[PDB]
Amino acid sequence: KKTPPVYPVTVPFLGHIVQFGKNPLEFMQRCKRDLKSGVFTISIGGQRVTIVGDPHEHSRFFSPRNEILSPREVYTIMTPVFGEGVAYAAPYPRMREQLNFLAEELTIAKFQNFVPAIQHEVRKFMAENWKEDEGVINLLEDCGAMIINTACQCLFGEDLRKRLNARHFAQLLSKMESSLIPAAVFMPWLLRLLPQSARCREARAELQKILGEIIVAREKEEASKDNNTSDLLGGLLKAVYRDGTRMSLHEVCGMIVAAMFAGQHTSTITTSWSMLHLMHPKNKKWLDKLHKEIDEFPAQLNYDNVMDEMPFAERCVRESIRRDPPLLMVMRMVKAEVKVGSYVVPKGDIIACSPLLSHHDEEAFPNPRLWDPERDEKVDGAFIGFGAGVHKCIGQKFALLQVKTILATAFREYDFQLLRDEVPDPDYHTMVVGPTLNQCLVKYTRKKK
Numbered sequence: 001k002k003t004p005p006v007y008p009v010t011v012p013f014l015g016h017i018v019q020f021g022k023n024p025l026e027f028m029q030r031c032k033r034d035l036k037s038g039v040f041t042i043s044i045g046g047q048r049v050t051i052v053g054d055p056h057e058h059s060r061f062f063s064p065r066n067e068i069l070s071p072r073e074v075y076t077i078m079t080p081v082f083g084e085g086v087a088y089a090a091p092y093p094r095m096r097e098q099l100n101f102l103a104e105e106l107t108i109a110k111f112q113n114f115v116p117a118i119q120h121e122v123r124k125f126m127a128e129n130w131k132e133d134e135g136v137i138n139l140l141e142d143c144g145a146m147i148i149n150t151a152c153q154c155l156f157g158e159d160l161r162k163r164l165n166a167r168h169f170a171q172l173l174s175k176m177e178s179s180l181i182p183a184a185v186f187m188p189w190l191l192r193l194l195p196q197s198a199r200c201r202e203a204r205a206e207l208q209k210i211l212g213e214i215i216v217a218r219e220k221e222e223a224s225k226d227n228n229t230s231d232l233l234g235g236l237l238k239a240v241y242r243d244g245t246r247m248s249l250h251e252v253c254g255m256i257v258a259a260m261f262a263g264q265h266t267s268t269i270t271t272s273w274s275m276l277h278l279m280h281p282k283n284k285k286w287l288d289k290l291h292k293e294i295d296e297f298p299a300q301l302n303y304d305n306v307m308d309e310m311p312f313a314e315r316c317v318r319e320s321i322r323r324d325p326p327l328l329m330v331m332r333m334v335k336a337e338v339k340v341g342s343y344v345v346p347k348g349d350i351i352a353c354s355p356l357l358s359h360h361d362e363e364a365f366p367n368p369r370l371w372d373p374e375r376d377e378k379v380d381g382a383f384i385g386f387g388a389g390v391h392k393c394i395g396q397k398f399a400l401l402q403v404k405t406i407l408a409t410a411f412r413e414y415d416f417q418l419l420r421d422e423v424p425d426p427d428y429h430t431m432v433v434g435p436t437l438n439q440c441l442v443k444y445t446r447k448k449k
């Protein structure tokens, strides 16, 4: 009949911004241990933030519709990235239509080309950059490059990959991004209008035009039929809203930007932790096992190699998303009271559910710091690496496709060694949390027989 515990505020303007910004894992865990309650409230600049940290309760969070627990507020910190009236910014009917359109373009029906195209770009990058028999590279850095490469390769039509290349596009992603403020999500009054924030404007507007140009190009080759180009951009342009309308350039640009920005960091980070773990000595058996699964593949890989025939490798990826969820927190705007366990949660609060917290609940994941791909969430619905319910991640299959593919190519044609005693500390100081960049230096030993 009343709110969840609160956590003592010793410095009233801050709330818990500092110990939360410092080590959110430790902290949230502390709240959950001390408050004797897996569900509890914290404050951020005096904004109530109720963390649903008991896995049995996940349903409570992910189930209510947008109108009760609203995404839109919590994501406004993106409207410059996506645009006005794009995604959440858009009314929920439309946002759903837009996300749907995207989702179609990312079903497995589209993936038929991808595994080969991905393998290609990876071998490319590796030969152009892992030229020597040995050498030391930054695994987080490179991967980031492989990912943006392999993604465009997959979702980007020849002509568009011409006028825009992966490397250049990434600079639009950085550019667009750098102008973001995490804090904004709790305190958007910050949002009110801030110097490079133009950039994200510039970064976007530049991109948009590029596409607006790209389109005119492909329309004037239809009489010929010169190319039957069905890349992500293609699909998006063919889509029709119910009301019989289509996506304006701005919405199309939005939805692709979203798509790629989405994949970029989450995917490179997951790739990074997975390789890291495997390449550790303690995980030899896990490496040994991986091999017994990719050794009897043809060099050229197809689909049936990847999804259907790499269950273990997929275990590694997921387990790695389990241990170090790139996205720490899923959040909504409580627009009306909601039951969560034996607590209620007041209209106006911020409700969150934390992959980071939940993946370290001891009931659900004994020894949560231990990376064990063979482990299984004791507690059904515990793992939320990809969210759940309505807004669960559509990019899910595609990302698994990339990482696994890359994992395969990489460890097949190379060996590896961590230049550190232990796998990198997470770096919780990025909006999308990865392994610590200046700790990701690795030594790649080419292979031969």
Ligand code: HEM
Pocket (backbone or CB within 6 Å): 099, 106, 258, 259, 260, 262, 263, 264, 266, 267, 270, 321, 326, 327, 330, 331, 384, 385, 386, 387, 388, 390, 391, 392, 393, 394, 395, 396, 398, 399
């Ligand atoms: C490791 C890779 C990935 C992780 C860890 C990840 C994580 C997540 C999470 C936790 C959510 C739910 C967050 C929320 O409630 O809003 C989500 C949703 C989403 N993800 Fe991903 N994701 C990944 C890959 C991708 C990729 C590759 C794309 C794009 C191709 C993508 C696009 C999205 C989109 C568009 C949503 C919105 C879901 C919706 O409301 O329908 N994700 N993802």
Ligand SMILES: O=C(Nc1ccc(N2CCN(c3ccc(Cl)c(Cl)c3)CC2)cc1)O[C@@H](Cn1ccnc1)c1ccc(Cl)cc1Cl
Pocket (backbone or CB within 6 Å): 017, 018, 020, 021, 077, 087, 181, 182, 183, 184, 185, 258, 259, 261, 262, 263, 266, 327, 393, 395, 430, 431, 432
């Ligand atoms: O969720 C995001 N972005 C996002 C927003 C906010 C944060 N943070 C974290 C740090 N914060 C913070 C922390 C600590 C302290 Cl102390 C303080 Cl103050 C502040 C503030 C809030 C982080 C990320 O969008 C992605 C998700 N995605 C990616 C792949 N699959 C899904 C996405 C979703 C849907 C669509 Cl359509 C496109 C895209 Cl790109």
